[PDB]
Amino acid sequence: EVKPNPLQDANLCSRVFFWWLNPLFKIGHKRRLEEDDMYSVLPEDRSQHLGEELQGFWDKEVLRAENDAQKPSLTRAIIKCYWKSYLVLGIFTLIEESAKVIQPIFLGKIINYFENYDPMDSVALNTAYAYATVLTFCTLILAILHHLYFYHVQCAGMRLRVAMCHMIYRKALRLSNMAMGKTTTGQIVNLLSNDVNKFDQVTVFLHFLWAGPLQAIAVTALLWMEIGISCLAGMAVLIILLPLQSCFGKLFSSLRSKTATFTDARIRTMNEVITGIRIIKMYAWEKSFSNLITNLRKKEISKILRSSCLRGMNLASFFSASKIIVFVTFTTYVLLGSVITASRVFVAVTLYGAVRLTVTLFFPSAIERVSEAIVSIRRIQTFLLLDEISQRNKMVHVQDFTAFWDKASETPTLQGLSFTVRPGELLAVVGPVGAGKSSLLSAVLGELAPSHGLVSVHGRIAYVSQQPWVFSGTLRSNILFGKKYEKERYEKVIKACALKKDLQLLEDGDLTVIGDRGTTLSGGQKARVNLARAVYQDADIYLLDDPLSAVDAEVSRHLFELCICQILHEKITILVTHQLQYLKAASQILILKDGKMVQKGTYTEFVGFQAYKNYFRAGAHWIVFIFLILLNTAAQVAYVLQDWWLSYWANKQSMLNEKLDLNWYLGIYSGLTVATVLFGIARSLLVFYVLVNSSQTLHNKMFESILKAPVLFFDRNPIGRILNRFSKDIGHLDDLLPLTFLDFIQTLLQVVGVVSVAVAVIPWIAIPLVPLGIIFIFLRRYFLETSRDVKRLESTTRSPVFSHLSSSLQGLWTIRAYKAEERCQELFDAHQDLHSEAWFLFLTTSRWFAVRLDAICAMFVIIVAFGSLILAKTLDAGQVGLALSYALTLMGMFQWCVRQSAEVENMMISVERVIEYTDLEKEAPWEYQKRPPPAWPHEGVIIFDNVNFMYSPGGPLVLKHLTALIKSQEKVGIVGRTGAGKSSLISALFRLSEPEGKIWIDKILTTEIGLHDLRKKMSIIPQEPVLFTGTMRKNLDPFNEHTDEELWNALQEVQLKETIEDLPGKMDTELAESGSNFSVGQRQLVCLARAILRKNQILIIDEATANVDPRTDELIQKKIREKFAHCTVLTIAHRLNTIIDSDKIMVLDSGRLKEYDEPYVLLQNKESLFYKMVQQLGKAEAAALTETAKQVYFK
Ligand SMILES: CN(Cc1cnc2nc(N)nc(N)c2n1)c1ccc(C(=O)N[C@@H](CCC(=O)O)C(=O)O)cc1
């Protein structure tokens, strides 16, 4: 292999510690890794090998099933070939679990030493060191050897996932055409992308479906030896935590599903704002959508907050459950008439610490994951059983042929069909239109099968489809398509396909990589690509669909005149083209109508601390975080002081031979338990409140920024980029970041609690702990700066796998036509076994960190266990029991604390990306203090004076020195060349970018007044209409100033009234999304209604009606002239008859006012560009317009 893998040769002492992985980090610490630096997978894990294992068992299972006449199931096959070897990892699960229940038994015997401490008894001390020794080995088993096991049970999921993806692909080639009607690309790619992805998860915990239950028995049996019948009270309070956890699971999932409606409703409404942001600004409707989204967000936070506070009680249960389970036991243990003893309780405290995770976390997660992963296997089992293409098998012969696309009541798609063609014979075909024209050709391939009659084909086949097809690779490779690079034949076809020049001139030659999903090439090349691919095959048979040759062009000739008519003419070619004049090339022409063969004759028949503090201080006043810090510490100090109190009671009890007053010692105990639950609850609710309240504040500050952003911003950023921040980023900020942040903080205090009791009880342990702190923080940087790349490579290598499946599935007939399936099969393995290289690093790099990180806290357990026995003279039974019963938890929590530190610091990028918009550069204020007088714009005088306009500041001048007088109520036609002037005159007049010079409206300086003063008083009919998702009333008047009778008047005048009055809600009918229930012309009629309602003294037409059919265009042109006769009107137009009667016309070119006069006075100057443009009409209509103009102005 090109990339050797050290795991093939590592000695066991190396691949237990992942010592073999160190060379990857020395690279990644110097350089950002690349896909060439990753190790190749083991021979055991190559996709080709896994597929041809499991496919064999699945084949046997299908064969067995039909012999039994009992339904096959895939879940038997993926067992019968992993049962052999996944159960081996089950054996090593025992010693992993047995460690968790043997440390507490030796933990008793070390504490039992201090209860019986004799300074001079060397034998007891040496005996205690026996128990202390095995306590580290039970710890090192659980900390070090566990990570080799846990790597292998993740690998058993990778091996299964790639075996499945390979069988899905092996099937997805051979799906019958029938099954291709049932399925769709999105469904089969969902198997690869969504469903088989579950098989990494199922295999991790799967052993807990037995080892977990067995362990819960084991801990109960031990405790019954240790603390008697009270253990049943403890275990019961643990077991009844299963249904409560399940109740929460259902309940917050229920609220989650509810929020998804408003999240979807917000985002889709947000999508309209970002798409239409130009049109929304022009109408000054920014206040409306501000209110509309604001009410959707309030209806969402009222449920996100309610669910999040519900998750607060959940996390408080994970925190506080151990303290409650302990409390009810020891309370019961004393109330049943017994006395606490430090050994007997720190054994029992530790055992609940072991079994709690298994019963509440791993065993329920195992049941959940296996439940949903078997949903996946049942979907895949449904897919594998789809019906599949039957075996097909210089000459083609077809007789009496009749077939259907499916067995149905529709007529046969081919009828009576028969023909024969032989070497030297060319066929051509004429047939249906607007239908599966290819149907005959597909029949010759066998993508449709005869219902009656016969087809036989004896040569190797080549084929082309009206849809071009190209897949992952170089353009050359698509042409070579698995054959050798025979340069002369290649050059001959590359010449004959008129490809050479265009390929080198436009796509840098055949070495160019074809972009993903084929995005690189132009269609006319991609068309030629198919023919070039086809003719390169040197097959015998050439079934040629039309290569989009319907354009009259030299290529559309040369491909036929040379390559077909001279080179290919001897080959068995069957040709379709709209260029039917070429049919004279045929030896025989098949002519069909509606799928009936009718004629057969020849032609002769014719992130950093700055980000965190902005996120936090947006959430609450800094004093609230001071109060939060007390709740964090007070929750934890209650948590530790509960267990210190249990140890203190043991010291008092063990100083007695009188009796302790249980009404006191249980009194304070229950206070500390109730305190730790209450502060455990109150912490979790408070953090969720403060952080969710931040997300509400960041959104509302950020959305108001988007509206005030200038149109330049939405030109600079594509709408997908902007909306994504409202979808994902301001999603995380309340869906998941508060939950992850609390989970980190909650556990981080747990770890600090462990080192605190350890250092408080054994004071010197701070001295070696400082190296451990110094070692850890060095290692986190050394790791994460390379782990971050492996996370990135794993994602970047994912999407080609699906891209190849999608691309292949879009082109199946072309693949099968050459029978070249195993070529596109092996190319999937080269994609699959490249993601497995990036995934194999994802597993083992996380395991490398977790091994070294657990060496730190396995050393800590060593330091406390031996440190206590070295320092035994000073210690006491209780305090050692405290220190150890805590320290033995540490290697559980510390991994999770550090894991969540990477999720938060990673997810914090969504905070910085949102904040990047929170201060985006604003437009000028919507409403300056110098509001225009109540003598509002009234005359409609508009002055342009030296107007110079650029879209970007310092960009090219799109208008230069533009200076014009438009008198009151004048009608002005505006004309320009393609791209010259255009709507840019409007963008200035609405100040969508800042004009230099001055524009006056009734001698009001437009740059002084607020944009909502300016944009309300003028009005526009924009180039494309938009109907927003909402009521017809809101599409007419979202401020609801007008009566519906007046809305009926407006809808009447655009003649939409009765169509809208027929709607089931009349004015209050909510439109379909983007108003798809109305055609483009109807939407423009709505745009006219908006102006008709507002009755502005200035109207602007943005060339829009050129998109509209003449009958509605006439109605628009009519109603404008009748309703806005007193208005000043600007008419950007192309079709000069729309403006030939304008009191003046402006002609703009190159951003300059080339003509400005009465149109005929321009036509009177035959040198004028307006006269030239009128003559460039090229028809006597120029005279009719000239006479029309003349009459208007001579009158
Ligand atoms: C103490 N603690 C906090 C925590 C978080 N969520 C919970 N959720 C439940 N239902 N119950 C809990 N006790 C619980 N506890 C922990 C402890 C260990 C691991 C943990 O080790 N998780 C591993 C298990 C594998 C391993 O690393 O050993 C994983 O799959 O990520 C997580 C959280």
Side-chain angles (χ1 to χ4, degrees):
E1 286 291 17
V2 178
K3 310 193 298 283
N5 181 333
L7 181 57
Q8 294 188 19
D9 64 74
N11 58 314
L12 184 64
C13 193
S14 176
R15 61 183 165 81
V16 165
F17 289 86
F18 296 92
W19 185 264
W20 63 265
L21 191 52
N22 296 355
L24 179 66
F25 292 119
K26 288 193 298 184
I27 294 164
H29 188 62
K30 291 185 296 181
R31 187 183 64 252
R32 182 167 59 257
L33 301 180
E34 178 176 4
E35 297 174 342
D36 195 45
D37 299 333
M38 312 186 301
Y39 307 134
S40 65
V41 284
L42 302 178
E44 301 163 38
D45 299 344
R46 288 225 58 172
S47 169
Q48 199 277 348
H49 182 278
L50 291 321
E52 298 305 320
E53 177 176 41
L54 179 61
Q55 180 64 24
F57 289 92
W58 175 238
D59 182 37
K60 287 167 59 175
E61 169 59 20
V62 166
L63 179 59
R64 182 204 67 81
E66 68 179 58
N67 288 347
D68 289 350
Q70 296 187 6
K71 211 66 161 68
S73 183
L74 180 59
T75 320
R76 294 172 55 86
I78 66 161
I79 288 173
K80 285 183 179 291
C81 64
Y82 292 83
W83 173 100
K84 300 289 194 290
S85 303
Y86 190 82
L87 266 295
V88 175
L89 309 180
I91 305 307
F92 295 100
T93 304
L94 296 173
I95 73 175
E96 187 232 313
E97 284 190 342
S98 179
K100 299 176 189 174
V101 307
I102 285 183
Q103 294 163 309
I105 299 309
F106 289 119
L107 174 63
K109 289 175 166 63
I110 180 170
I111 300 160
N112 179 266
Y113 170 67
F114 295 94
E115 295 273 26
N116 298 280
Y117 185 70
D118 290 335
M120 69 294 297
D121 191 346
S122 304
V123 180
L125 180 58
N126 278 271
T127 304
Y129 282 122
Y131 303 135
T133 299
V134 66
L135 184 62
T136 69
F137 291 173
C138 293
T139 303
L140 289 167
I141 286 168
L142 180 55
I144 300 300
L145 280 295
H146 169 63
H147 288 131
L148 179 57
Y149 155 81
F150 198 92
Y151 165 48
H152 278 297
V153 301
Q154 286 185 302
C155 172
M158 175 183 78
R159 295 197 299 140
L160 178 62
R161 191 191 78 243
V162 307
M164 295 288 218
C165 291
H166 182 270
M167 294 192 309
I168 311 316
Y169 191 82
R170 178 174 166 149
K171 191 74 183 199
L173 296 190
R174 64 200 277 159
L175 289 171
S176 174
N177 49 43
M178 301 291 180
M180 197 54 51
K182 183 186 298 290
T183 60
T184 191
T185 297
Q187 188 64 245
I188 311 184
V189 174
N190 279 353
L191 304 190
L192 277 65
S193 61
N194 188 80
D195 300 346
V196 309
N197 202 344
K198 301 296 182 277
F199 303 146
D200 176 60
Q201 306 192 28
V202 72
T203 63
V204 181
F205 299 123
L206 180 61
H207 284 300
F208 294 112
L209 298 190
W210 68 265
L214 177 60
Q215 190 183 68
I217 294 297
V219 169
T220 305
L222 292 177
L223 288 169
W224 190 21
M225 299 290 290
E226 296 299 323
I227 70 166
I229 181 59
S230 293
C231 70
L232 184 60
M235 291 303 304
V237 172
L238 176 60
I239 289 294
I240 70 189
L241 191 48
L242 284 166
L244 180 60
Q245 163 57 9
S246 306
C247 173
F248 287 153
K250 284 184 180 289
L251 188 61
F252 61 68
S253 183
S254 176
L255 279 78
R256 179 171 63 210
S257 182
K258 196 176 297 292
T259 64
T261 67
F262 299 104
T263 303
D264 185 30
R266 180 171 56 74
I267 289 165
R268 79 177 178 189
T269 304
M270 191 63 65
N271 198 351
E272 310 318 327
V273 175
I274 301 304
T275 303
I277 190 62
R278 191 186 85 129
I279 295 163
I280 293 174
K281 283 180 185 300
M282 286 181 157
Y283 291 126
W285 285 354
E286 294 177 305
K287 281 182 177 285
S288 177
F289 293 94
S290 181
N291 292 342
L292 179 56
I293 295 300
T294 299
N295 288 353
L296 291 168
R297 190 59 165 157
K298 285 176 172 283
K299 290 193 292 187
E300 188 185 42
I301 291 295
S302 303
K303 291 172 175 66
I304 284 186
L305 185 146
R306 193 185 304 268
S307 182
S308 294
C309 296
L310 177 63
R311 292 189 296 182
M313 298 188 186
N314 185 33
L315 288 193
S317 84
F318 299 158
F319 165 76
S320 67
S322 177
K323 296 292 165 254
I324 282 286
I325 291 157
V326 156
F327 165 66
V328 304
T329 297
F330 296 115
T331 298
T332 303
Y333 181 32
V334 303
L335 295 182
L336 269 57
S338 203
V339 292
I340 296 294
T341 288
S343 58
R344 198 161 295 277
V345 306
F346 283 114
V347 175
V349 171
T350 309
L351 282 165
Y352 300 123
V355 67
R356 180 182 64 96
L357 273 64
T358 290
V359 172
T360 75
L361 176 59
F362 304 144
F363 179 69
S365 300
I367 287 170
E368 179 191 57
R369 265 59 184 203
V370 170
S371 300
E372 72 184 51
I374 288 172
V375 175
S376 291
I377 296 151
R378 187 161 49 74
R379 285 170 55 78
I380 302 317
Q381 175 189 299
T382 300
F383 181 78
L384 267 48
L385 297 172
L386 292 174
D387 201 6
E388 60 183 73
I389 291 293
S390 302
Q391 176 173 356
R392 188 190 69 81
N393 181 251
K394 308 99 184 93
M395 310 186 181
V396 177
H397 174 283
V398 179
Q399 167 174 354
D400 304 330
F401 180 95
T402 58
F404 313 81
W405 278 44
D406 60 352
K407 289 185 173 72
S409 62
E410 289 79 10
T411 64
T413 54
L414 282 173
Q415 298 170 41
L417 173 64
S418 60
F419 57 91
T420 310
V421 61
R422 252 65 171 271
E425 307 298 336
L426 189 148
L427 300 184
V429 186
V430 192
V433 295
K437 293 181 179 178
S438 186
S439 297
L440 185 152
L441 283 69
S442 303
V444 180
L445 289 174
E447 304 308 308
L448 298 174
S451 66
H452 310 276
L454 171 150
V455 178
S456 189
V457 183
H458 293 276
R460 186 173 181 188
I461 305 105
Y463 165 77
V464 303
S465 50
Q466 59 79 25
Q467 173 58 51
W469 176 76
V470 201
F471 83 156
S472 304
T474 61
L475 187 143
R476 185 187 299 166
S477 301
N478 277 267
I479 302 308
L480 297 182
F481 216 79
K483 193 164 64 175
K484 297 196 300 181
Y485 193 20
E486 296 194 275
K487 195 55 150 48
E488 294 84 355
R489 293 191 181 186
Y490 185 88
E491 287 180 354
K492 186 62 171 183
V493 302
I494 261 60
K495 288 171 179 285
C497 301
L499 185 57
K500 184 63 183 290
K501 293 182 180 179
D502 294 3
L503 171 58
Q504 294 193 140
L505 290 168
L506 309 177
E507 284 84 42
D508 308 335
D510 70 343
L511 184 59
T512 291
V513 177
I514 303 299
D516 65 293
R517 299 84 173 176
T519 195
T520 307
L521 273 65
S522 180
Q525 308 302 335
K526 207 185 298 181
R528 268 173 278 175
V529 167
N530 313 279
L531 181 58
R533 176 178 62 236
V535 298
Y536 190 68
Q537 298 312 303
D538 308 320
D540 297 346
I541 323 302
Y542 294 82
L543 307 179
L544 303 183
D545 201 358
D546 193 326
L548 307 183
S549 189
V551 68
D552 294 348
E554 180 171 17
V555 176
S556 300
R557 290 184 64 182
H558 179 267
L559 295 180
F560 290 75
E561 291 181 352
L562 176 60
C563 195
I564 293 165
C565 293
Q566 320 306 325
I567 308 177
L568 204 68
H569 193 276
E570 183 166 35
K571 309 305 178 75
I572 322 302
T573 189
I574 305 186
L575 177 62
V576 174
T577 184
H578 190 71
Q579 296 288 9
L580 297 162
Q581 72 282 2
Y582 303 155
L583 290 172
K584 194 167 183 180
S587 180
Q588 294 188 348
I589 306 163
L590 313 186
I591 299 186
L592 303 96
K593 187 174 181 179
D594 200 14
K596 298 187 298 181
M597 169 164 267
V598 68
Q599 167 179 15
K600 295 176 66 179
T602 83
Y603 66 85
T604 66
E605 199 161 53
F606 299 164
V607 75
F609 187 65
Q610 301 298 335
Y612 295 96
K613 84 183 185 75
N614 287 342
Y615 178 48
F616 281 6
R617 298 300 187 269
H621 316 80
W622 78 275
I623 297 297
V624 179
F625 289 104
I626 301 303
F627 181 56
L628 171 60
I629 291 295
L630 292 166
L631 288 191
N632 279 352
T633 308
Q636 202 62 31
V637 170
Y639 183 99
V640 167
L641 289 180
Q642 173 171 323
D643 296 338
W644 169 91
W645 183 255
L646 181 63
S647 81
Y648 169 75
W649 186 3
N651 286 0
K652 298 303 299 286
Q653 177 57 37
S654 58
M655 291 297 101
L656 268 64
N657 304 98
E658 67 190 325
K659 188 175 291 183
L660 304 185
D661 187 359
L662 302 184
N663 292 11
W664 179 6
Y665 286 101
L666 290 170
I668 288 178
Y669 202 126
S670 61
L672 293 168
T673 300
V674 169
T676 197
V677 174
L678 289 180
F679 296 140
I681 294 281
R683 177 185 68 213
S684 304
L685 302 184
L686 184 70
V687 176
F688 273 114
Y689 158 77
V690 172
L691 299 184
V692 171
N693 189 57
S694 187
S695 189
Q696 183 172 22
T697 303
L698 288 176
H699 177 276
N700 293 356
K701 195 179 292 185
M702 183 265 278
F703 182 57
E704 292 170 18
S705 180
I706 285 286
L707 290 179
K708 291 179 182 181
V711 305
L712 175 62
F713 170 75
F714 303 98
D715 191 12
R716 185 62 64 234
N717 296 273
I719 65 175
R721 183 190 295 170
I722 301 158
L723 181 66
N724 181 262
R725 307 207 188 182
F726 289 98
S727 180
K728 281 195 176 183
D729 290 329
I730 204 57
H732 286 307
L733 263 62
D734 50 50
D735 187 29
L736 181 61
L737 181 59
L739 172 67
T740 308
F741 220 120
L742 178 58
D743 185 6
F744 174 50
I745 288 293
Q746 174 159 293
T747 311
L748 174 59
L749 296 164
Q750 310 319 303
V751 168
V752 174
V754 174
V755 305
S756 176
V757 299
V759 172
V761 168
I762 308 97
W764 304 111
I765 300 316
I767 302 303
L769 179 62
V770 169
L772 297 180
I774 290 292
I775 287 160
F776 168 69
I777 189 59
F778 291 7
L779 193 147
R780 190 184 189 275
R781 293 197 298 255
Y782 184 82
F783 174 66
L784 289 178
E785 301 309 315
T786 302
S787 172
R788 282 176 171 199
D789 278 329
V790 176
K791 267 67 176 183
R792 185 262 299 172
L793 293 170
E794 188 287 323
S795 180
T796 304
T797 54
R798 194 201 319 303
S799 68
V801 181
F802 312 151
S803 181
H804 186 279
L805 171 63
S806 176
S807 173
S808 175
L809 187 57
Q810 295 314 136
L812 267 180
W813 291 356
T814 313
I815 288 174
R816 297 197 292 234
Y818 312 115
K819 303 294 294 178
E821 289 160 34
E822 289 68 2
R823 179 55 187 151
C824 82
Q825 184 64 258
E826 288 182 347
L827 288 167
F828 194 66
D829 296 325
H831 285 25
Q832 197 68 261
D833 303 337
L834 174 65
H835 182 259
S836 301
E837 296 178 355
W839 189 264
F840 165 65
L841 299 182
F842 180 107
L843 304 182
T844 59
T845 209
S846 306
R847 211 57 45 211
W848 178 95
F849 181 31
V851 165
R852 329 323 297 253
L853 186 67
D854 276 22
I856 293 172
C857 51
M859 283 173 70
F860 196 79
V861 172
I862 293 153
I863 287 159
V864 174
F866 284 73
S868 301
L869 288 172
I870 293 163
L871 203 79
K873 288 284 295 294
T874 312
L875 285 163
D876 61 83
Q879 300 300 343
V880 173
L882 176 67
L884 280 166
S885 181
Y886 271 65
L888 292 164
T889 70
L890 185 55
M891 83 295 303
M893 293 172 178
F894 190 36
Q895 296 200 33
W896 190 251
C897 180
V898 173
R899 183 180 297 278
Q900 294 311 318
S901 88
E903 295 201 51
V904 175
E905 184 173 16
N906 178 68
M907 195 175 301
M908 205 56 51
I909 72 184
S910 294
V911 162
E912 72 169 15
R913 289 201 302 234
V914 166
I915 288 172
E916 181 174 66
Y917 288 2
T918 301
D919 66 0
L920 178 65
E921 177 176 326
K922 297 180 291 184
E923 285 184 286
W926 294 354
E927 295 190 336
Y928 278 110
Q929 295 184 349
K930 194 175 182 282
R931 190 180 296 177
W936 311 296
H938 169 271
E939 309 179 35
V941 172
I942 310 177
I943 313 300
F944 297 81
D945 183 15
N946 194 11
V947 179
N948 289 272
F949 180 95
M950 308 161 282
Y951 280 108
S952 60
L957 284 159
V958 187
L959 295 173
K960 299 172 181 177
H961 313 82
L962 188 151
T963 299
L965 162 62
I966 302 182
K967 292 187 177 181
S968 179
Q969 75 169 352
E970 286 193 310
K971 311 301 176 282
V972 184
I974 292 155
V975 186
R977 286 173 58 255
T978 294
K982 293 289 293 182
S983 205
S984 318
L985 192 78
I986 298 173
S987 308
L989 182 57
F990 296 166
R991 293 172 56 209
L992 291 169
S993 190
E994 181 174 19
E996 298 199 330
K998 295 183 183 176
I999 293 175
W1000 310 75
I1001 299 172
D1002 297 6
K1003 302 185 179 182
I1004 306 165
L1005 180 56
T1006 54
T1007 56
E1008 299 191 335
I1009 71 174
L1011 296 173
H1012 289 189
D1013 312 327
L1014 183 71
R1015 296 174 185 163
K1016 281 185 180 179
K1017 297 299 183 187
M1018 296 186 281
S1019 181
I1020 182 159
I1021 299 188
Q1023 178 180 354
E1024 296 175 37
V1026 172
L1027 299 186
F1028 299 103
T1029 308
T1031 64
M1032 272 303 312
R1033 200 185 299 244
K1034 286 180 179 178
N1035 272 274
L1036 292 165
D1037 180 8
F1039 301 148
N1040 294 272
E1041 299 194 326
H1042 296 292
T1043 64
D1044 60 342
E1045 298 192 341
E1046 184 69 345
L1047 306 179
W1048 289 128
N1049 296 330
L1051 291 180
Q1052 179 182 7
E1053 291 304 334
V1054 309
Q1055 304 192 352
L1056 292 177
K1057 169 172 177 187
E1058 298 197 324
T1059 296
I1060 289 159
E1061 195 173 33
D1062 289 346
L1063 302 176
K1066 299 184 181 177
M1067 304 308 300
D1068 305 324
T1069 310
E1070 288 190 314
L1071 305 178
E1073 290 187 356
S1074 201
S1076 64
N1077 61 280
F1078 291 128
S1079 300
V1080 177
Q1082 295 166 317
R1083 305 179 199 163
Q1084 295 209 18
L1085 288 169
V1086 180
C1087 295
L1088 175 60
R1090 296 170 187 160
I1092 286 170
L1093 290 166
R1094 286 182 164 196
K1095 302 178 189 178
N1096 308 86
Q1097 299 298 337
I1098 296 161
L1099 173 65
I1100 299 186
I1101 313 300
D1102 192 22
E1103 214 195 330
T1105 86
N1107 298 284
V1108 181
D1109 294 346
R1111 297 176 184 177
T1112 299
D1113 186 23
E1114 284 174 19
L1115 174 64
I1116 293 161
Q1117 291 295 339
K1118 178 178 180 179
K1119 289 289 173 188
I1120 289 165
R1121 293 163 203 275
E1122 299 170 356
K1123 282 292 185 182
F1124 303 86
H1126 63 294
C1127 307
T1128 297
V1129 187
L1130 310 186
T1131 26
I1132 304 191
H1134 178 70
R1135 199 184 70 226
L1136 299 179
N1137 70 348
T1138 62
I1139 56 168
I1140 194 62
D1141 69 332
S1142 307
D1143 303 323
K1144 295 179 174 58
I1145 279 173
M1146 294 169 71
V1147 184
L1148 307 185
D1149 194 20
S1150 303
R1152 295 187 183 282
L1153 181 59
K1154 297 302 186 175
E1155 312 288 0
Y1156 187 46
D1157 215 339
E1158 309 193 326
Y1160 187 77
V1161 181
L1162 308 176
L1163 302 181
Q1164 185 65 19
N1165 182 6
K1166 298 190 178 181
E1167 301 191 333
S1168 70
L1169 183 57
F1170 185 67
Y1171 184 86
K1172 291 172 179 178
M1173 286 173 169
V1174 165
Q1175 303 316 316
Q1176 287 157 2
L1177 186 56
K1179 191 177 175 192
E1181 297 183 20
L1185 268 72
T1186 301
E1187 178 60 20
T1188 300
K1190 198 177 185 181
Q1191 290 180 18
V1192 170
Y1193 311 119
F1194 278 47
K1195 284 177 177 184

